Design a protein around this ligand. Structure first.
Ligand code: HF7
Ligand code: HF7
Ligand code: HF7
Ligand code: MG
Ligand code: MG
Ligand code: MG
Ligand code: MG
Ligand code: MG
Ligand code: MG
Ligand code: MG
Ligand code: MG
Ligand code: NA
Lengths: 481, 481, 481, 481
């Protein structure tokens, strides 16, 4: 039990403390080797074969880099070795809750399979961390290295998920407030998890990263802001922080929300829903779970990975035939068809709780055109995509604190108009894409008429080639024509 | 006289046609080995040692890549080998007119030394191309490779400078209109010269490039727009084109307009102005020129490179003592001190003719604070920087045309609101930086009070560090809190 | 059916002809998404998540690049569009026969499971290509794009596996001999499959590539050598060819034969052998196969991927308990322990048929050291690795032909002594690694003594750490000090 | 006077201690901005525009990285902050003594201009460091940061040049012996100066680096070897150390000893020799120096940079006409022509004192062929190149010490045969290149016959193109033919 060195292509040679090695070398952590970072994105970007495992190593490494740098520049913060280890463990473990195909699972699958439950990957990360610690005897090893599990497990979970129910945290007191801004920053979103995925996703996607996290670390300092110690950036780095959120948005546009990647995620989700009654995942006491109920037992969840796709694709049971046929269509590239895209107008925003009603609304639109085929609710997919700077409608840079070179302990704010008139005026928008599971030319022509009528009925923006693919619908709506 | 292969770190192994080799292997072209691409930027970014020569090779290479690709995908454009060569020569030669320290020369030095003249590096490029061709017997070699010098020299110069005095070009007829969009695109600025410097500057600066020119080329086509053939992009690339101008702006912000890089260029310009009466450059017929008049004689201009800096630094002539002293202060890093940065508010746009009044205004501000030292107008430098998307106040993407995959011969426009609500609302702005020649702590404290008061008096934006550098001045202005 | 552009992180935007797209979009080709290029190497190098799929796209792309370049520089070769497509298809499909964990399957598993059979991934590639063509109606699409399936299928298979039964090939006549040197070069090993994996493996492993394939392509020409047309290199590039084989050897040393990577492949192979009696894969006509017999039916083999590992790891069947326990030990990092490495001295070359006797020899060595524990044959693993320049004992550069600048169609030979005295004198060697399945410190201390004694008894090389791991054994051997 | 951050493209954001900033911001250090790292190599590799300045920053940074890492892992070494600073300063300053065009100056120019003197860039670095310290008041700033100038200046100079006159060093006692292995390692050549130029030269040249210095640092430890503390490497990294010297050799072959790069350096050297009587460099007290005597006066040497080339190229003095004509021919690419290359056979080695006699030997060969032109001694250039692993005929890995994982304080040796049979059998060789100053086809044909005959007469290796350039000469020699 000494240090291991691991060679990562993004970060080079990284050192792992032996307690971190003990955490990594568990079924709960090694599971992340079998979950793709970008899910169905790999079916569009063939370099994007990378998994949550290596990303987790990277996050843990960067968490260590930031906390060490702060402690070397500011010994008055009294950052301890124990603090450093706890921060590295939180960084390492904050992806433990991801399910098959990452965001597909918590973003698409669980909301449709278990609409009553409130599941997030962050909650999953805490539950899975706890399962990891308790199933592998990690607490006595934490003690052996000078951690106090009672306080430190709490601190680690709070770094992942936020306050577990006034300084609201219990794992550390207010004089270590800044430690909660490293792994998952709920104040403004500037955290080490982003820094890893920007570099790693870019390396794999074939799109080049333009944010420099190392520079950010060299300029970061802790200062008192409204009687709390916070991580501040140097004033003249404000431009680079606007660019960082721009880079995130650009990665969503180019890659994460690619229209074919999203439809592949939708098709996989559909196959899972059709397979859900038949796939068995064994959990504690030999109880059997399904894909949708594995989240209720961490022993079952440990065994729920991207493997489910192949278990379905390779099955021979006739009960799995419909699920298997969807995955086969993905292989033949016979995809659900893109019908069109629109945006709401203004601050107008469709909420998650209305998502399920949308296919029905589209199917109930009454286009005044002669239609051969009639389509049903279940023939449409309606994908609602939120493109924002991580804080809904808010500018995250308004929630960053800065210091200037002449008074490095004094925190200040910088407004948008102090920076540049070329920056966005809004920080959120929503795209709505519609697709049809019926792929013949008749169906697809009809689907477009339903779609364009629905856009008119909802006062959404005119679809870009609306005059060509629905010439009899677009003239009713005079802001469009 | 066959093909040469050259290994460039940005583009890899590049082929040069023997006619291009004949052009390169002249004193007029080789001169570009002694002119830094980024001028005083090298004194801030020590990787930025690269010169105009290797940039020119790159531009020539990319010009060839684009024109070849268009001709392979669209043989109906009738792009000839002669067209290809002429476009490669224009690309290669469009940096010939740059002077010592690149933009310092035409952006700062000549405007102050010869305020009566209208000099641009593009005009210089034409004059120097002509001098290159005539001094080295290139016309018979052009004939040998199928070029018609009368027409082709005209075409090449027109690609560099625009129309030399209703289709306005004489080098090629309207059916080859698209060939004028490759090397220097006056309609929207999307040209191969940017593509080279984005990649090359980034490689040397230590900032990573996020634009993919190869992707753009795969998706580019020529289409008829308002009865003219133009280079158009696929519809789905619109987002990437907004990102490309965002990348340009970001490189200006981080590197090209770095506040210390700019002050170094200012100090070098000041040394050149003080040297200008005394340095001699010999030109045609043994006539003597100065730094400021070498632009009038291409034989003299051929010998005007970054060497002037060292000729001044190493001089012993007592007449050069003042100029030499400024350069010596640069070496000791005794630089004019940065005081702050502000922007005008609104459509307000400060013209060149008002630049001279600005140091006076700063010095006349009456901050209501006890000051030991008093500063004079001559102690302040006020640097006004125009930041835009290359078409003054206009959105260049409104001047690009796009096609969709199922109707590739129909070009259309895409508006800003069809793409995203998160895009810029303005496309031009001004930054104003102030510096003080007096460098002691007393002077610099006073300078900051004058500066912040001046910003308040002019209704300019609050400086980012204003509450720290001028705590008594920032509360008077209620627009600021 | 138009061309698709795909973004690959190694090669950028690559074009896939519609025939290639039809081949790719099949269950037989998409299978390669679920087979890791480097097998158990991912368990050592966490960047090495890449699969055979994206490697195959790269090899197809590079095959296209070489054949196009040869035809552009030398139109007299009469390379047709049909030739180009056949070479691209061979490049794309030459990885089709790989099994779970790539080299683990054909290098370790099948030799132990079916010692009587002679299976290679190349034979598998041919069989799988045939199954792909016949199950997906590809022959009519080949006809549509100008191929003649009878001859071209033969040519493609010959490019993958060599002559299918005096010019020995039937797919193309001798005047196109050079086309068989692109995808899998049996004459000297210089082929585009290597060029892709050097770049792609390095990008993912975090080890940097030093070979420049683009340079090689610019310098490659076809010349007549001993009455046959061959791909020749420029004379002065001979040093870069020696470096290419040096790079391959270095990648084997650092990554592909990593001692822990190899032990993980050994442990996975051991789990597969224990699982082989119980896992069933359904093939053509509903016949049932095992992991070891799936190679006999392409319908079954289509469903044999890295998924097998997870099928075993997640099983609950008591019959799979022993197999599952081995995989669980991998997850806990309870790995067989590395004891040491040695080499034979001289021409001595251990053959496959003697591999089984080696653990017995190690266990029978009589070290003169006090040992508590006694180890048996079954406690040792002995891994024999052949390290060479791809042509067993031969120098591959002796099988390359070169041209000089003054006579570019005239082939010559270059001997090793004309190039450098710093080059290898031998081109093949064996490494022998020993490991212990008993993992406690007593057992491992004993294992090292048996190991070092065995090396002394066999006149093998002194282990690098021999004086530290066996201080009382190394002095007996005077060859060693 | 706090820390500065500098963005370097190779190492990223680097911190410079304020004492280092004071050293850098002097005319003696800033001079290195005007000296190309690779001299005439820029005239072949157009990316190789980088200067000694940025390389120096890199060496200083890496020296700091190594010494810090050793001190963090091994606090028992008692490495002090003072030690760290002294090592960083030596790393920063060990390139101060380079002259115009780097190796051209001390490798070609000074040996010919001042054959009586024994000048090395390392001696120049010491002299220039002394001049820097004394002219800029650095000693009291050293005191201010805890250095003891008397001892520490000595230590710094000893790190650059070796012992300044039984432990032979005075700057530090034997218990800090390992500190002398960081900046310039005279025992085996493994030092941080190589590590910087490998990465930086590669970045600029367009050749990719395959050595990982960060890995080496993670594995380096200090251990007692023959009663002295030395930097040792981990046993299993021995292969990477062989690769490191292979990489150095490969960079020499591809770039540093490029045949055209070398002829350009020869031509520049010749121009400097012809200019040397006439160019004046002013030094201390207004005394005048020449190019060849500026090495005797650090004030003059401060002003001796690559600018000399342009001072000659731009001159009008008739006395400089001959020098100026040579440089003009370089611009027109009218270069002396490459005739061929050969090697001696065996340990046979041509020494420096015989270099001048070689053109006479070539010219006295009697080729048995009809020749039109006859050539004389002064028509030939003979360039002798020594290619080795840095220790003449010796294997530098024999002078490295290693530790193993089970006994990390115990140093051991590893022999070549313990590592691999594929390694070099020799570690030094010589290349001889011949060139002709007469460039017409007749002269060059004759030159090749003299050359190839001379090779046959001296039993040198057959030129690679010998059968093509001299078909009537190569059959006489049966080893060749
Ligand atoms: C850049 C590059 N070069 C290598 N030569 C090289 N060898 C292994 N690696 C990678 C693989 C891993 O990600 C990491 C550590 O591998 P390493 O072989 O050092 O550790 P291992 O645990 O096998 O050895 P010991 O227990 O004996 O110390 O470094 C390498 N990376
Ligand atoms: C990556 C890498 N590897 C090399 N081994 C290597 N050798 C030269 N170069 C670079 C330097 C130049 O920029 C370019 C062409 O060099 P090259 O040596 O081919 O051209 P040269 O004109 O000297 O030869 P010939 O006239 O005999 O054909 O390629 C290399 N680049
Ligand atoms: C990657 C990238 N991004 C930037 N946004 C950026 N801005 C400057 N640099 C480069 C230029 C220099 O090599 C280094 C330090 O520049 P910096 O501008 O931080 O320092 P400066 O001395 O001007 O400001 P202070 O005195 O106010 O702190 O960082 C940058 N590099
Ligand atoms: Mg290990
Ligand atoms: Mg987050
Ligand atoms: Mg050449
Ligand atoms: Mg432009
Ligand atoms: Mg498509
Ligand atoms: Mg092969
Ligand atoms: Mg500064
Ligand atoms: Mg050295
Ligand atoms: Na700059």
């Amino acid at each position: 039990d000494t240090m291991k060195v691991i060679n990562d292509p993004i970060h080079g040679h990284i050192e792992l403390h032996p307690l971190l090695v003990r955490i990594i070398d568990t079924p709960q952590f090694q599971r992340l080797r079998y979950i793709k970072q970008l899910g169905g994105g790999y079916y569009v970007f063939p370099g994007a074969s990378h998994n949550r495992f290596e990303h987790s190593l990277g996050v843990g490494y960067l968490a260590g880099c930031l906390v060490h740098a702060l402690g070397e520049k500011q010994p008055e913060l009294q950052i301890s070795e124990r603090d450093v280890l706890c921060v590295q463990i939180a960084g390492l473990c904050r992806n433990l809750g991801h399910g098959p195909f990452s965001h597909m699972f918590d973003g698409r699958f669980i909301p449709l399979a278990r609409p009553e439950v409130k599941w997030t990957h962050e909650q999953g990360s805490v539950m899975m961390f706890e399962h990891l610690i308790n199933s592998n005897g990690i607490k006595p090893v934490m003690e052996q290295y000078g951690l106090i599990p009672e306080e430190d497990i709490c601190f680690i979970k709070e770094q992942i998920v936020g306050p577990l129910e006034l300084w609201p945290y219990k794992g550390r007191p207010e004089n270590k407030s800044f430690l909660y801004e490293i792994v998952s920053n709920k104040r403004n979103g500037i955290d080490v998890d982003k820094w890893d995925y920007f570099a790693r996703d870019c390396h794999h996607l074939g799109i080049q990263n333009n944010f420099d996290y190392k520079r950010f670390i060299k300029f970061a300092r802790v200062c008192e802001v409204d009687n709390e110690l916070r991580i501040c950036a140097r004033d003249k780095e404000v431009g680079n922080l606007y660019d960082m959120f721009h880079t995130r948005n650009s990665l969503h546009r180019r890659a994460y929300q690619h229209k074919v990647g999203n439809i592949i995620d939708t098709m996989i989700t559909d196959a899972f829903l059709k397979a859900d009654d038949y796939i068995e995942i064994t959990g504690a006491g030999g109880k059997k779970y399904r894909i949708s109920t594995a989240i209720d037992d961490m022993e079952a969840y440990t065994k729920l990975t991207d493997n489910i796709f192949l278990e379905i694709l390779y099955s021979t049971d006739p009960k799995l035939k419909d699920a298997r046929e969807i995955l086969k269509q993905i292989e033949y590239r016979n995809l659900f068809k893109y019908v069109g895209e629109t945006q709401p107008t203004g601050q107008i925003k469709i909420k998650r709780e209305d998502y399920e009603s949308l296919p029905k609304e589209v199917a109930s639109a009454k286009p005044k055109v002669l239609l051969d085929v009639k389509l049903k609710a279940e023939d449409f997919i309606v994908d609602v995509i939120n493109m924002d700077y991580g804080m809904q409608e808010k500018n995250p840079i308004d929630h960053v604190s800065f210091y200037c070179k002449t008074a490095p302990n004094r925190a200040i704010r910088i407004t948008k108009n102090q920076v540049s008139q070329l920056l966005p005026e809004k920080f959120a928008e929503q795209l709505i894409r519609v697709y049809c599971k019926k792929v013949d030319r008749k169906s697809l022509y009809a689907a477009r008429q339903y779609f364009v009528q629905w856009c008119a009925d909802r006062n959404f923006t005119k679809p870009q080639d609306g005059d060509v693919i629905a010439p009899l619908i677009t003239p009713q709506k005079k802001e469009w024509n």
